[PDB]
Amino acid sequence: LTMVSEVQPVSPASLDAPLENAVEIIETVISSLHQGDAPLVGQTDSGKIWMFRYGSAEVFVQLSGHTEEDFLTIWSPVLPLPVADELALYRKLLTLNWLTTFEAHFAIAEEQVQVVASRTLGGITAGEISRLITIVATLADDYDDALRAEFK
Amino acid sequence: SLTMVSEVQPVAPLENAVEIIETVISSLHQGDAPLVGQTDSGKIWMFRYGSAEVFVQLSGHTEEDFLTIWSPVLPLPVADELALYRKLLTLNWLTTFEAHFAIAEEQVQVVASRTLGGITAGEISRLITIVATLADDYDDALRAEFK
Numbered sequence: 001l002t003m004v005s006e007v008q009p010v011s012p013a014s015l016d017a018p019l020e021n022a023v024e025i026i027e028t029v030i031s032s033l034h035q036g037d038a039p040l041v042g043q044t045d046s047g048k049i050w051m052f053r054y055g056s057a058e059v060f061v062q063l064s065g066h067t068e069e070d071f072l073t074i075w076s077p078v079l080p081l082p083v084a085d086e087l088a089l090y091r092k093l094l095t096l097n098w099l100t101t102f103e104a105h106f107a108i109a110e111e112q113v114q115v116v117a118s119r120t121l122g123g124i125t126a127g128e129i130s131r132l133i134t135i136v137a138t139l140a141d142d143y144d145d146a147l148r149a150e151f152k
Numbered sequence: 153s154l155t156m157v158s159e160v161q162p163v164a165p166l167e168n169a170v171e172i173i174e175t176v177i178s179s180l181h182q183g184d185a186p187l188v189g190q191t192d193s194g195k196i197w198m199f200r201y202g203s204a205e206v207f208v209q210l211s212g213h214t215e216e217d218f219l220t221i222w223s224p225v226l227p228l229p230v231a232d233e234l235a236l237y238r239k240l241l242t243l244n245w246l247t248t249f250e251a252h253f254a255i256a257e258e259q260v261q262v263v264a265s266r267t268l269g270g271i272t273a274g275e276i277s278r279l280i281t282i283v284a285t286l287a288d289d290y291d292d293a294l295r296a297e298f299k
Binding site for chain 2: 073086087090091093094095097098099102103105106107108109113114116118119120122123124125127128131
């Protein structure tokens with residue numbers, strides 16, 4: 001009497017894709033990266049958004065949707081303005097913006113200096129999502145204190 | 153430091169990296185043929201887009217290596233540096249996309265830099281276009297307002 005233990009040993013895996021599943025990825029990434037209160041989550045007219053703490057900084061992650069034309073934006077305010085010597089500040093931020101900040105960079109918004117990285121979702125991978133959130137967070141944690149000590 | 157300078161011949165996103173960049177640059181460039189060369193920090197490319205000269209660099213072929221796309225848009229010094237730097241750091245907020253403004257070698261640069269991990273042909277074409285069009289748009293605008 002013939003027997004077949006596994007009628008279907010393997011099968012085409014229905015694989016979660018990084019584009020359609022950027023959410024679950026952002027979540028497991030923040031789950032391990034955060035060093036603070038349970039991260040918060042909300043909805044903006046521009047999409048889903050997460051808030052967490054890394055070191056001394058507050059980091060924001062926003063996913064406006066799951067199509068290639070959509071954006072993944074990560075930022076963290078590092079220094080409140082104005083400041084006594086804005087020229088010496090702005091020139092430093094812009095000099096640092098040369099390779100040193102990698103995929104992220106310094107900018108000005110909402111009366112504050114922000115560390116930010118923004119990109120389209122086309123061709124995005126889990127490794128890249130993990131990398132961008134980490135870069136913005138580590139840069140933000142390293143420079144918020146250094147910048148205050150020097151311009152306050 | 154430049155070397156092996158030559159012109160781009162119009163011919164696995166990590167293996168065809170060089171062929172991909174050259175294909176993108178060939179379709180994008182205007183005017184003289186795009187150039188290619190060796191640098192001690194990696195392989196480099198040079199082409200014209202509008203009024204700007206755009207540069208590209210591939211420092212290697214591994215996942216941790218870099219792709220840097222940049223272009224000079226305004227020579228420094230300038231009269232109102234405070235007003236300029238403020239404007240640049242303000243456009244740096246979302247408006248410049250994956251790219252952004254910086255300062256390097258006494259000149260204002262438009263640049264986008266990233267790691268090769270997970271990179272696709274599509275992203276390479278987009279980053280280069282983004283820097284190229286941002287540079288062509290602002291070098292004139294910035295010269296007018298500050299030079």
